[PDB]
Ligand SMILES: O=C(O)CCc1nc(-c2ccccc2)c(-c2cc(Cl)cc(Cl)c2)o1
């Protein structure tokens with residue numbers, strides 16, 4: 254559950 | 267004191 | 280070009296900025312966010328399945344952060360420049376008990392980058408090569424990452440042959456800083472696991488997540 | 492040529508041959524004697540001051556032994572061939588509790604050597620590069636070792652361009668197995684230090700001396 258990495262990697266910017 | 271390495275490295279063969 | 284050095288250089292330019300171990304760890308955690316941004320601007324990285332993007336960065340992050348702060352430090356004497364703006368000198372590093380690994384960064388990376396004047400396109404390509412690590416465990420398509428690695432070092436060879444035609448061994452020289460990088464990355468990682476285990480040092484959330 | 496690939500190949504040819512951890516350790520100790528013989532047949536090595544010859548081999552031995560038994564293992568399936576003549580299979584390695592590092596040797600080294608058909612001149616040159624490690628601590632003249640490293644990889648580039656002209660990226664590919672080698676060497680070393688510390692395994696005298 255790499256919560257923070259996963260979130261930064263989805264975000265389209 | 268790397269005894270064994272030193273001895274193998276001097277020997278002229 | 281399927282992997283032009285122009286875009287890799289832009290990636291690098293786009294993300295451009297008392298216990299010294301605490302300072303180093305604040306900087307590392309800060310730069311972990313900037314790392315993800317960097318990776319997305321490397322051609323084809325964002326096209327990989329999210330799971331493989333995760334595996335590459337989990338595999339690469341420590342070497343990617345070390346490559347950055349090393350290159351950023353070339354103009355510095357006997358010290359490193361952190362992303363926070365703070366210079367750390369080897370005297371400080373020795374006095375916090377991390378002299379040996381700190382000396383390794385100076386002697387094997389910073390110095391070698393200064394001596395050869397490694398430019399930012401070259402840092403870019405080396406970091407791209409390290410990112411596209413086909414040996415990373417659990418990749419859905421290792422061949423894809425291998426082929427992306429192949430395209431980066433082909434562009435790097437050609438950049439070097441064109442930009443520094445007088446130095447026929449420059450390409451080999453660049454590639455031959457990666458073993459030292461691997462080695463220093465693993466020793467750095469062993470240190471951070473110790474700072475964590477011990478609770479001597481504040482480890483911010485994203486650094487913490489990369490150490491679990 | 493100051494560093495002809497002919498002589499490096501001859502070096503390789505000249506030194507050519509139940510707990511699996513015990514077997515691996517008997518083989519390692521046997522091959523430590525053959526390593527010293529090998530090193531002396533690499534052009535210019537024997538001309539270095541004895542102290543630097545000691546430093547290079549102390550620095551290099553683990554990677555040099557790993558490069559040999561990996562290349563020796565290309566024709567083997569899911570296993571390695573020891574110098575003792577004994578094949579070790581990954582099932583055995585897993586059952587002695589060294590599966591993970593064993594899988595790394597198969598996936599990152601053996602497989603990659605088979606896939607590209609790394610020839611013995613190439614193994615030779617990679618091992619020569621690893622031997623002439625200018626980053627080794629305490630060298631009396633790092634520039635000398637750096638210059639010997641430079642001459643090996645220049646000969647290797649030229650051998651590759653001449654022998655496999657159809658594969659323009661072969662040289663880069665060879666150099667890009669050295670990080671994995673560094674990584675696997677350090678994890679192997681951490682294992683042997685554990686076998687020693689614990690007294691689970693017989694460690695013969697010369698292996699023992701390389702772990703002090
Ligand atoms: O400012 C930056 O760009 C990041 C600084 C940074 N980042 C790590 C690190 C190492 C390894 C993994 C992740 C981050 C380190 C570091 C440096 C030394 Cl000399 C020793 C140690 Cl233990 C760490 O410093």
Ligand SMILES: O=C(O)CCc1nc(-c2ccccc2)c(-c2cc(Cl)cc(Cl)c2)o1
Nearest residue numbers: 515518519522553556560573574593679682
């Ligand atoms: O037969 C030979 O040529 C030498 C065999 C050999 N030599 C080492 C070694 C590793 C590292 C340093 C020195 C020797 C190992 C080794 C292999 C695995 Cl898969 C795991 C481990 Cl822990 C060791 O095996």
